[PDB]
């Protein structure tokens, strides 16, 4: 749950802060966190299940890092970041939906979807950052 929230928070920060013309110093830490997320998620295969009418969806992560070369973010940087962020947002939204539609009588607080259960592994703890909600 902390890893999923951190993924969503990183994506929201990327959407809000990676904008055309912005100083890189405004996003340096955000870019580092986003690249950490990319590194952690790369090479992992996820599946969001077919409970109810939810389609079964398979997610592969093979993204390259966001650049660190521009003093001010330009349109091309924003477009590449937008592509990556769109894929990640789709994944996170599907994971959230797959988790919301499941319940357990024994351990209802624990993750029920297999994607969130996988994200609860230690290898994803690196993605975790600010929890302010």
């Amino acid at each position: 749950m902390d890893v999923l929230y951190s993924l969503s928070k990183t994506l929201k920060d990327a959407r809000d802060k990676i904008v055309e013309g912005t100083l890189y110093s405004n996003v340096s830490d955000l870019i580092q966190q986003f690249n950490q997320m990319i590194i952690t998620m790369n090479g992992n295969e996820f599946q969001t299940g077919g409970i109810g009418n939810l389609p079964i969806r398979n997610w592969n992560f093979d993204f390259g890092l966001l650049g660190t070369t521009l003093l001010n973010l330009d349109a091309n940087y924003v477009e590449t970041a937008r592509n990556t962020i769109d894929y990640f947002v789709d994944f996170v939204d599907n994971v959230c939906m797959d988790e919301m539609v499941r319940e357990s009588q024994r351990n209802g607080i624990a993750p029920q979807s297999d994607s969130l259960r996988k994200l609860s592994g230690i290898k994803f703890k690196r993605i975790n950052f600010d929890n302010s909600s």
Partner: protein, 779 residues
């Protein structure tokens, strides 16, 4: 250079060929005796150790078996053709062949012996080889002890040769060299289906010597740097140094009667320096050796050349202090004076580099953007074709960063220098003009550097680890100025022969590294599993480092060697070595019990026990097992030296079994047995508190004894109070010992695959880069 000689003298791998079957046992004729001890007219064949040299003491026996493991690893071949071992079997009905000549000797001895059964002679007459030429297979009859058969069968079934063909030879070339359109590869031979080759063991570094072995990694990186220097191509058709100096003098407007900074701009401009800079840059990036920047702050041309160098080379390739000094000189000489900013007061040990502070402080977009790029220009760690590589930014590869740098320099030239005398601005402008009159040449040079770097990087087999090294390679900024000022339009790319030589040297070093790792790991694991607690393993690691051929072990302390031992101890053993050691572990007890020099122990009982009947001994006081007897371990007693228990047991006549590899006296005298001498050989233990001198008596009572009539004339079965914990030899069954060893009828093994590939280059004028454009484009 001696380092280059050492690194290029490493041969690929000494290929081992088997000339005879590995044997630990041989048949031997022994006189046999009847149940009453009378000698039979017939003899009998028994399995006996070929070299019975087992030592005294269990620890020494385990040491002997470690040595035997080393011997078997030495004798294990890479491939085997049994027709080489095949010899004529003179008693074969079809005049066939057997392997090895030792088998032929056994067959002749058995066949010629009058005591041999006719069925065995029939069997020897049927022993011949079968050739299946269609499958390229041959089976040969061989006579082997079961352990010998196990070892030889493992050798036969686990050879290292694989089929070789033109496709394999072509794919042996790195994928990036084959994909390059600047090289044309050709072959003039069709390798037959019987061609063979041995793959190099290109496993990546299992010791991670780049992590916490800083001296060893410094040596490795120095060797890599020297080799890279040896293979980096030489610049051709460089601009004439005299003409370039004349042109620079005209551009700088040198004045005889005035002291001017611009004069120093001409310092150290020559073709030797340019070639040295080219080689140093490419070799340092290839070997990932840290570089040190040498420059004089009074030479502003050095600072402009350093601006270019920091633009093209990632800044982690330079030691931090030198990079900081160069950046501070650039900031305080070119940038801040140009923009009228107060001289930067930079603190030694600042977390930020001078360029980062300047980037935060500079309001000019072009200069600040170039500063940001230089700050964030890093290598990219990418696994290409299974090897970790440090890849340059694509803008460096295509040379656009040169355009960004030139934009920054042109912005600097347009500044007013408000607080400086006009001559200072003139000198800075003149240096920038010297650099900017060669903008296209600088783009070409950047592209050439990147292309040569990646082409030679395709030839690296071991992971390129980016870690700052203990020592650095000094790079004079005047050499960078020479390279910038003298580079022409001639494209130089690595020769295909140079690329193949570099790749072969890297492969040889990598394979030797892995093979020596395997040897050391196997030895260490075997010693641990053989419980050799008194063995100091420094010798193993010392031999390992010596065989790597690039370290001076005199300079390596013992602590580092034991750290290497600890790292090696965690690695799994290679499959062939591990299985050979498994065979040795399985069969070492039997091999030891086959020895005639030592016994497995001595049972001191204090009651009459009848001597056992065994055909090859007559009557013998042998114990097959230590059942019903308390055991004293002689190795533990010798290690601890506490003889209280054994002394008390010997003084109290308490039956016991002293267990451990012991030498024994063979005594055939019946009178000696009646006199009970075997029971008189244990008081020295109590007297001297030593057991290394213990030598129990092994009675061998039969008709060859002088006083055997006592046995025969009194219906008397000999008895003794002491027994020797020993095994009797296994009989030699000729039919059971016959095995059909199968191998390939014939093949040819090849060493250097690239010898079959002839490669050439396209015209350098038309050589292209990754972006499909020519590497150099200036007129």
């Amino acid at each position: 250079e001696s380092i280059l000689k050492k690194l290029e003298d490493i041969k690929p791998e000494q290929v081992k060929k088997q000339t005879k079957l590995f044997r630990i046992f041989e048949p031997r004729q022994l006189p046999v005796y009847r149940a009453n001890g009378e000698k039979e007219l017939r003899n009998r064949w028994y399995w006996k150790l070929k070299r019975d040299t087992l030592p005294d003491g269990d620890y020494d026996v385990r040491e002997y078996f470690l040595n035997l493991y080393d011997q078997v690893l030495t004798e294990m071949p890479d491939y085997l053709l049994l027709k080489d071992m095949a010899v004529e079997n003179k008693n074969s009905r079809d005049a066939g062949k057997v392997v090895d000549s030792e088998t032929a000797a056994i067959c002749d001895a058995i066949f010629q012996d009058e005591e041999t059964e006719g069925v065995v002679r029939r069997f020897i007459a049927e022993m011949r080889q079968r050739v299946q030429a269609d499958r390229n297979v041959v089976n040969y009859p061989s006579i082997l002890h079961p352990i010998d058969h196990a070892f030889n069968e493992y050798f036969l079934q686990h050879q290292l040769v694989e089929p070789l063909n033109n496709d394999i030879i072509f794919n042996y070339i790195p994928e990036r060299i084959r994909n390059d359109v600047n090289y044309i590869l050709n072959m003039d031979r069709n390798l037959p289906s019987t061609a063979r080759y041995i793959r190099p063991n290109l496993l990546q570094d299992r010791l991670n010597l780049h992590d916490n072995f800083e001296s060893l990694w410094d040596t490795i990186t120095t060797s890599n740097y020297i080799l890279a220097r040896s293979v980096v191509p030489d610049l051709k058709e460089l601009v004439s140094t005299e003409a370039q100096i004349q042109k620079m003098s005209q551009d700088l407007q040198l004045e005889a009667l005035t002291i001017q900074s611009e004069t120093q701009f001409l310092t150290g401009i020559n073709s030797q320096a340019a070639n040295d800079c080219f080689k140093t840059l490419i070799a340092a990036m290839l070997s990932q050796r840290t570089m040190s920047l040498d420059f004089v702050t009074t030479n502003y041309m050095s600072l402009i050349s350093g601006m270019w160098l920091l633009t093209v080379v990632p800044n982690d390739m330079f030691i931090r202090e030198s990079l900081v000094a160069c950046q501070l000189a650039i900031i305080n000489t070119i940038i801040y004076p140009a923009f009228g900013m107060q001289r930067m007061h930079y603190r030694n040990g600042d977390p930020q580099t001078p360029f980062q502070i300047a980037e935060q402080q500079i309001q000019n977009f072009q200069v600040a953007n170039w500063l940001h790029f230089v700050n964030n220009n890093q290598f990219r760690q990418v696994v290409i074709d299974g090897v970790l590589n440090q890849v340059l930014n694509d803008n460096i590869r295509n040379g656009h960063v040169v355009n960004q740098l030139m934009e920054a320099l042109m912005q600097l030239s347009r500044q007013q220098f408000p607080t400086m005398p006009v001559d200072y601005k003139r000198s800075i402008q003149r240096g920038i003009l010297l650099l900017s009159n060669r903008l296209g040449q600088l783009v070409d040079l950047t592209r050439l550097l990147a292309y040569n770097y990646e082409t030679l990087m395709a030839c690296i087999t071991m992971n390129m680890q980016h870690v700052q090294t203990l020592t650095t390679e000094k790079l004079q900024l005047t050499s960078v100025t020479s390279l910038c000022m003298l580079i022409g339009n001639a494209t130089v790319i690595p020769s295909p022969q140079t690329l193949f030589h570099y790749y072969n040297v890297n492969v040889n070093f990598h394979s030797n590294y892995n093979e020596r790792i395997n040897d050391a790991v196997a030895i260490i694991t075997a010693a641990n599993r053989l419980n050799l607690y008194q063995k100091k393993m420094k010798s193993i690691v010392e031999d390992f480092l010596k065989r790597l051929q690039i370290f001076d072990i005199s300079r390596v302390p013992d602590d580092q060697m034991y750290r290497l031992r600890d790292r090696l101890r965690l690695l799994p053993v290679e499959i062939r070595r591990l299985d050979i050691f498994n065979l040795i572990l399985m069969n070492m007890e039997q091999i030891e019990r086959a020895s005639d020099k030592i016994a497995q122990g001595v049972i001191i009982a204090y009651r009459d026990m009848q001597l056992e009947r065994d055909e090859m001994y007559g009557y013998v006081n042998i114990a097959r097992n230590l059942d019903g007897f308390q055991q004293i371990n002689l190795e533990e007693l010798m290690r601890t030296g506490d003889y209280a228990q054994i002394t008390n047991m010997l003084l109290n006549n308490q039956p016991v079994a002293l267990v451990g590899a012991l030498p024994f006296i063979t005594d055939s005298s019946v009178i000696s047995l009646v006199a009970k001498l075997d029971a008189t050989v244990f008081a020295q233990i109590v007297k001297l508190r030593k057991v290394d001198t213990l030598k129990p008596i092994l009675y061998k009572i039969n008709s060859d004894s002088n006083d055997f009539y006592l046995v025969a004339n009194y219906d008397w079965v000999p008895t003794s109070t002491t027994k020797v914990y020993k095994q009797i030899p296994q009989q030699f069954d000729f039919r059971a010992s016959m095995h059909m060893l199968t191998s390939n009828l014939t093949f040819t093994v090849y060493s250097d695959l690239l010898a079959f590939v002839s490669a050439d280059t396209v015209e350098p004028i038309n050589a292209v880069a990754f972006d499909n454009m020519r590497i150099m484009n200036e007129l």
